[PDB]
Amino acid sequence: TKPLPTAPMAWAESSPRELAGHAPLRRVLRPPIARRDTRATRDDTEQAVDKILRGARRAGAPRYHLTRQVTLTDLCQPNAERAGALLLALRHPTDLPHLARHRAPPGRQTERLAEAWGQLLEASALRAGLVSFNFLVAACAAAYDARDAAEAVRAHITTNYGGTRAGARLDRFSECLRAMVHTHVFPHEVMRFFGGLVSWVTQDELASVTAVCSGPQEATHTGHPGRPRSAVTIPACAFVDLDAELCLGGPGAAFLYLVFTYRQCRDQELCCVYVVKSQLPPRGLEAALERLFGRLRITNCTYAAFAELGVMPDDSPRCLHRTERFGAVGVPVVILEGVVWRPGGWRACA
Amino acid sequence: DVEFDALLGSYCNTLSLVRFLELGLSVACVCTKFPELAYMNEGRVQFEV
Amino acid sequence: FEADIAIPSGISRPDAAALQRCEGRVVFLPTIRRQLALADVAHESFVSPDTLGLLLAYRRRFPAVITRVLPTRIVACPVDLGLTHAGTVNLRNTSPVDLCNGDPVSLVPPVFEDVRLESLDLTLRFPVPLPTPLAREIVARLVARGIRDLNELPDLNVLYYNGARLSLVALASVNTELRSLVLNMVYSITEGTTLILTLIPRLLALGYVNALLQMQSVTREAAQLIHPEAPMLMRRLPLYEALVAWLAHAGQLGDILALAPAVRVCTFDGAAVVQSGDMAPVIRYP
Amino acid sequence: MITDCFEADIAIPSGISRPDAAALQRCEGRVVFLPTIRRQLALADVAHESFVSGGVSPDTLGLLLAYRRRFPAVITRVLPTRIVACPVDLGLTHAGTVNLRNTSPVDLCNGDPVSLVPPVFEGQATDVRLESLDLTLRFPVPLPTPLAREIVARLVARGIRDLNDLNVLYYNGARLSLVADVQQLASVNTELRSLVLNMVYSITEGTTLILTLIPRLLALSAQDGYVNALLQMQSVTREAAQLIHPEAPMLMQDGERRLPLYEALVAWLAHAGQLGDILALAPAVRVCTFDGAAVVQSGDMAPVIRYP
Amino acid sequence: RDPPGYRYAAAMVPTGSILSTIEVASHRRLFDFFARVRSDENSLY
Amino acid sequence: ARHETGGGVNFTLTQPRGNVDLGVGYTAVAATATVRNPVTDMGNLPQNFYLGRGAPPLLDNAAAVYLRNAVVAGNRLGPAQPLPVFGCAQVPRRAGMD
């Protein structure tokens, strides 16, 4: 509002270069071508009408695409988890007892997935919905290498999610996912990316979750004008660098990646989700997945499956490693800063 | 020693501007102008012989 | 950015309503250009191709989703350019499959079951916008059906998507229409697995690569090699020039059969599932 | 803008002779491999001397294998003090129309994807050498993808001859010959292992059904003129039916609930149909002229739209 | 086909005359709505 | 300048400048007075060539593997992971330095 830092203050208005185009086109000239040669309220609501008028005279800001989806709150909760978390969408679940009957290798139980899903609708009772990311860590908590924070993600979810015996879902939904590895319908064939949290509307058993399906994170209309700011929070069981493990300390934009790992053994199968920050392109990524995840490849003919997640466009990308309190339990949480979401497709690696 | 280089002169052109109505061919035309054509669907002409 | 497709005059009452029926349906235009004729869109311009021919021609042409359809011109917004400019365009389902939220959508020539303008005497075949996980399955089923018709099964005619039953049968035209794919898929495999059979017994050189080979071939590939060579036998064969013509052919079928998405569906204030026949808010830009 | 244009700035050094500074403005739209996606690089991080290993200059086969470790960027504008480039791997421009330049002898068409190759051709291995800095710039050669899938097949197959002619192409009637050159053993074994891991993974139990259909093909090729034009004069399956009489297994393990032919094709596509991408790099760019013509000629700049 | 008949009230007041006279029906295909009448007809009114 | 990243907007200022030395002859001097602590420890850390590459292996794979394992083993230097084929060998990380 007309300050006196006018070297850059005019450039924060979007400028004087708006007249750069407006002068020889609109200010001059007769060309297109010429010839040759009653005490408090109103003004309280009256400035609100003026605020409509201040918004109507003119119509930098990068674009978004917000999505909303009405979501039953059995497996996921937008309530316990704050704005700036990953979410994951799903498909319909009665295709699970059908595709496992034909995609299995010969010599396995094709009736394993058909019974394991009904035991989750009969355990979350004590439909392409949603699974939040933090809920998915505590289910796959029994397969990690940093198991202590895996036992901290499970430490709050049984006490903070809406429902009774969420740990009975955690022990059953992971039993569903351990049946996905056996019945050969892999969970990357089910899990679909859904953007980061900005706002959510609550009701009985259903929630209206709003998220950014594409764009930057830090400037979204979060809804609260007191805090229209949110950062991305990830538990430390999943966050795997490939800058330190490959000694690439050179600066540049880092790419975020969702990665599954598979382990097929006879009734001893595991699930792990990892978010991978790398400076690698997607064409030069699988060679690093060969290096770290070759133990699961020898013991199994896929071993991993990944997809793109977003780009930190900083020349030096910025990470954090803190312990936030979701309810009453401190979980070691990796916080990413300056994150721009762009999704992508999946990949098989037999 | 003393030396130069030099420009000796420079020469533009003049684009000829040709009004269409200067040309004998305008005989074959009957030109009129809608200020709005684009708002028109099929136009017609009636004859009677 | 938006291109125009001029309708030639002389359109009847039902044929002008026929272009009104196809509001948000896909159109391939050859070059992004401001003015463009309606003969270029039409099925006559594709010469006539089979389903291997149309998949080549959907990779050269530039897809545009039709926006508002005026009586004089058809307005088309292209996907590669103006959809990075214009954010969201509506797009109408013609598939029997309901589009869910956030699906990578590809387009497929209409193999299953087509507006013909009688006053103009040209047909407009539109592709069928179904998502990429089905697009890689339905073509792979229809190729695999074509091989069992080259000597079927009780299965393979039925697909389940989103709890709904799909029917590929609903046919003798379809099996001969898709036949030039099948003669390429059979050729690209049988030339492949003989070059493997003619080079692993030719070299089997041990640095560690044969140690990586034969251990991975330990009753997996070498037993598969021996069971092939049991159904086989063990001059100079023109081996090293057959690699080149196969790699140039094998890398070419991967791009026809890729069926890459253009469209992602970020719905907002709407249903998460777009039904068949309805319009879906469609973006291609992040 | 940051998502649209993220424009790397190769800084130019201080002392550059006008024979060499005017060489850079002749290189407006060409391709530069940024090692990372910094916003500030140098010419010593771009040039061919950056591309070398320790004492080992890569041959034309191995020089492909470290393009794909870097980020291909088209130069957009060459200022006198720095060179501005747009990396393709992020996003091209706002509206997205950048310009390459054909250093190839091959014309392009609309819709053709553009794969770039090291300078393979004869009379074409053209390196701008900056003698006032000692920096040679191997600008790569952009090609249509039915060429780069063929040339990489010529260079791979020629090295496998050396473990125990081929160097002449044709594109639209133009006989063009690529340089016959020595090839290092470390580069070929990376290529050789990249085949056999991907080919042998593309074999499944359903493939023993398809091998029974080989004498159907020679029975069919003598009738149709299309298969007779499909197989070749110089194929292998024309000889691998007259030595090979296979038979299919009658029963299979759980052979009612599984699909034998369906599992083979997907295992084929994800390992063998993908393989032309594995040895070379991916065509992340295709040509969309607006109003000029269908064909961009050699030496002329070409408008550019990103390619999925 | 949509050949709407011409508008007699307007054609009652012509803008300008034709000049050459020929048998018109000899070449039809130049036109869209083409009608012959013998000396008079009922639909004109 | 202006560049916008991570949603934040960034300004950068630059200035062009120039240097000419208008003295004829030596116009300035650098005397090195004292010595702070030497950086490199003056150590004994011999070299391996097995970090390096490009020498023809001796012909018997029984022996060529034999030597290397009897040399590279336990050396303060010698490659830990077998040589990555492409960029460089890397020195084992030291637990702590003095």
Curated annotation (Swiss-Prot), chain D:
Alphabetized GO MF terms: structural molecule activity
Keyword Cytoplasm included in the entry's annotation: no
InterPro entries: Herpes_capsid_2
Gene Ontology terms: cellular component: host cell nucleus; viral capsid
UniProt xrefs under Pfam families: Herpes_V23 (PF01802)
Localization per Swiss-Prot or TrEMBL: Virion; Host nucleus
Keyword vocabulary terms for this entry: Capsid protein, Host nucleus, Virion
Biological function: Structural component of the T=16 icosahedral capsid. The capsid is composed of pentamers and hexamers of major capsid protein/MCP, which are linked together by heterotrimers called triplexes. These triplexes are formed by a single molecule of triplex protein 1/TRX1 and two copies of triplex protein 2/TRX2. Additionally, TRX1 is required for efficient transport of TRX2 to the nucleus, which is the site of capsid assembly.
Similarity remark: Belongs to the herpesviridae TRX2 protein family.
Subunit description: Interacts with TRX1 and major capisd protein/MCP.
Protein name: Triplex capsid protein 2
Organism: Human herpesvirus 2 (strain HG52)
Gene name in the database record: TRX2
